[model samples]
Target: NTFLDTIATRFDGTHSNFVLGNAQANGNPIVYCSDGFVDLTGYSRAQIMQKGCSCHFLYGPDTKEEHKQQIEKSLSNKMELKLEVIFYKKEGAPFWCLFDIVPIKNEKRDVVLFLASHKDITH
Candidate 1:
């Protein structure tokens, strides 16, 4: 909560912003945004909730294959990573992003969710 509040301070809730999302093993997903995500994507929580984090169009054919592979490997092992990723906007425009990702586990020690925070670096 403190971390999120800190993010809210730096982002203007405009085109330049930060976004956080969680993807669960059961296929349910959740997205949280600093003012910036809503500003940049032109989609409110209500609208984006329909498509989840993928609505940002961050992953696509042009996304680096190596990066994708790295992410896949890390997720499979339930690891945490801080990486630089090139992402696409809702409008299909490309931008660079910094990603912080972690695997979340349940009491049973099963990997239940992948939580990530994304920040656009193309300001």
Candidate 2:
């Protein structure tokens, strides 16, 4: 109860200015997003929630295949990863983002969620 209860409080009720995803679900969907993320991506609550795995929305023409592959492999394997990529804004502006992702495990040591933080290096 303590493990999941904490996440439910910290991640569900409030926000991440960061992003919180469900590890057990398909696409590891974005379940919680912070206002800081909206400020950076120019994506409102309606925009970010409808999109699964918010990181993928950042993909664009200049976004490298290497970074995509790494992201895929890490998510599939439920492993922690840190990488940087070129992300696109709602209006098509490109910026560099530093992504740090880690799996949040339950009391049983099973990965139940993923917490990822996004930073705009372009700023």
Candidate 3:
């Protein structure tokens, strides 16, 4: 069973689009995305998984380089961060996306996953 089952209820309580990704993977590919993510990103689970590199779905031409650096730093250092930035979804205008990102660690304290809850602040 996926860790999201029991670990994700707090995330679900907010009704935000929550995502879980493997931090140890080469590209930090998403392992799970709530239904709200599909609605917000306009991509279904299959497509999202098929093309699921972290940046590919969240960053675009208009995304600030600084924002990219911040995200990279957090991922590499396995740190928690809260970011408010202009992130683009497929074919949609850049919108203010708020992400609260946390790193989940194993018993040995190795960072194993990254969990994030996304809030579209544009509305």
RMSD of each: 5.1, 2.9, 2.1
Q: lDDT of each structure? A: 0.59, 0.81, 0.76
Q: How high is each candidate's TM-score?
A: 0.59, 0.86, 0.84
The sequence of per-residue lDDT tens digits that candidate 2 reaches over residues 1-123 is 554346646755454457778877888988877787888888897788776664888799999999999888888999999998998989989999998888899878999887778888986
Which stretches in model 1 have alpha-carbon errors above 4 Å?
Answer: 1-24, 31-35, 40-43, 50-56, 105-112
Q: Which candidate is the best by lDDT?
A: 2
lDDT of 2 at 2: 54
Query: Candidate 2 versus the native: TM-score?
Result: 0.86
Name the candidate, 2 or 3, with the larger TM-score value: 2
Ten-residue stretch with the least lDDT total in model 1: 19-28
lDDT for model 1: 0.59
Evaluated against the true structure, the overall lDDT of model 3 is 0.76
lDDT per residue (tens digit) for residues 38-87 in model 1: 66555576665555433334676667888876766666566887878787
The superposed Cα distance between candidate 2 and the true structure at residue 105, in angstroms, equals 0.3
Candidate 1, position 86, lDDT: 82
Per-residue lDDT for 10-81 in model 3, tens only?
666666687788888877888877888877877788877764424457688878888888888887788998
Candidates by TM-score, descending order: 2, 3, 1
